[PDB]
């Protein structure tokens, strides 16, 4: 349970979507972040993986602003305090808007996985995960925008998947947060993306997963192939 309160992109701070304030307003401030109705600081579980809610979280609507970021530079996501119990991977995606992200139809986005970390040390279950590294780093996560990525407008989809109840079907808890970015000073590369409602299934090996038993088999990070 948590959300992203802001990001630092190319050394500049951008306020996020303040989900405990902005839904409770007629005319909330413009942000690079997408709006959601996830006011419980909750999640999308396997019941919603083929619902448009999985794309940018519950009932999400376009952010009206866009942040610039140099290809090869870093984005830092600032989360509200993440529970240690909520062990799981941290995954980051880019989907091209092919024009202004403020007016892209979210159902048309095709996401490329540009970063992902999963199980760090499973020797003593439930083990140490990306989420735990996030906690250790002042509840922040940093990703590099590939220097080779083509300049353009993209939806940046950053997600924690908490696996503390993932042994049950539809038990994993997805926490996506979306942001509009413009990659500058890029190369020519772009991945082949996967629709938001095709990213995950409730029987995927990294989704229906028991963190509390022997982890000698590791952890297969879910979602489509990492861009190289
Ligand atoms: Cu929670």
Curated annotation (Swiss-Prot):
Cellular component GO terms, alphabetical: extracellular region
Enzyme class: oxidoreductase
Keyword Secreted: yes
Domain of life, source organism: Eukaryota
Disulfide pattern: 56-178, 97-101
Subcellular location: Secreted
CC cofactor note: Binds 1 copper ion per subunit.
Co-factor requirement: Cu(2+)
Residues recorded with modification Methylhistidine: 1
The enzyme's E.C. designation: 1.14.99.56
Post-translational modification: The catalytically essential N-terminal histidine His-1 is post-translationally modified by methylation to prevent protonation of the histidine side chain, and protect the critical active site of the enzyme from oxidative damage.
Catalytic activity entry: [(1->4)-beta-D-glucosyl]n+m + reduced acceptor + O2 = 4-dehydro-beta-D-glucosyl-[(1->4)-beta-D-glucosyl]n-1 + [(1->4)-beta-D-glucosyl]m + acceptor + H2O
Activity's thermal dependence: Optimum temperature is 60 degrees Celsius.
Applied use: Lignocellulose is the most abundant polymeric composite on Earth and is a recalcitrant but promising renewable substrate for industrial biotechnology applications. Together with cellobiose dehydrogenases (CDHs) an enzymatic system capable of oxidative cellulose cleavage is formed, which increases the efficiency of cellulases and put LPMOs at focus of biofuel research.
Family note: Belongs to the polysaccharide monooxygenase AA9 family.
Function: Lytic polysaccharide monooxygenase (LPMO) that depolymerizes crystalline and amorphous polysaccharides via the oxidation of scissile alpha- or beta-(1-4)-glycosidic bonds, yielding C1 and C4 oxidation products. Catalysis by LPMOs requires the reduction of the active-site copper from Cu(II) to Cu(I) by a reducing agent and H(2)O(2) or O(2) as a cosubstrate. Shows activity on phosphoric acid swollen cellulose, on NaOH pretreated soy spent flakes as well as on crystalline cellulose (Avicel). Does not have a positive effect on cel6A activity, but acts synergistically with endoglucanase egl7.
PANTHER family: ENDO-BETA-1,4-GLUCANASE D, PUTATIVE (AFU_ORTHOLOGUE AFUA_1G12560)-RELATED
Protein name per the record: AA9 family lytic polysaccharide monooxygenase B
Organism in which the protein naturally occurs: Aspergillus fumigatus (strain ATCC MYA-4609 / CBS 101355 / FGSC A1100 / Af293) (Neosartorya fumigata)
């Amino acid at each position: 349970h948590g959300f992203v309160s802001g990001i630092v992109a190319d050394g500049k701070y951008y306020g996020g979507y303040l989900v405990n304030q902005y839904p409770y307003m007629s005319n909330p401030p413009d942000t690079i972040a997408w709006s959601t109705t996830a006011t419980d600081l909750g999640f999308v579980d396997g019941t919603g993986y083929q619902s448009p809610d999985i794309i940018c979280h519950r009932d999400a609507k376009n952010g009206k602003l866009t942040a610039t970021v140099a290809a090869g530079s870093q984005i830092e996501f600032q989360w509200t305090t993440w529970p240690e119990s909520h062990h799981g991977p941290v995954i980051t995606y880019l989907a091209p808007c092919n024009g202004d992200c403020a007016t892209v139809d979210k159902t048309t986005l095709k996401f490329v996985k540009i970063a992902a970390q999963g199980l760090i040390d499973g020797s003593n279950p439930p083990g140490v995960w990306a989420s735990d590294e996030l906690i250790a780093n002042n509840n922040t996560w940093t990703v590099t925008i590939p220097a080779s990525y083509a300049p353009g407008n993209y939806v940046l989809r950053h997600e924690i998947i908490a696996l503390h109840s993932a042994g049950n079907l539809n038990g994993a808890q997805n926490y996506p947060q979306c942001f509009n970015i413009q990659i500058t000073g890029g190369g020519s590369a772009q991945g082949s993306g996967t629709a938001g409602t095709s990213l995950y299934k409730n029987t995927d090996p990294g989704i229906k997963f028991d963190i509390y038993s022997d982890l000698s088999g590791g952890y297969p990070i879910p979602g489509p192939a990492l861009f190289n």
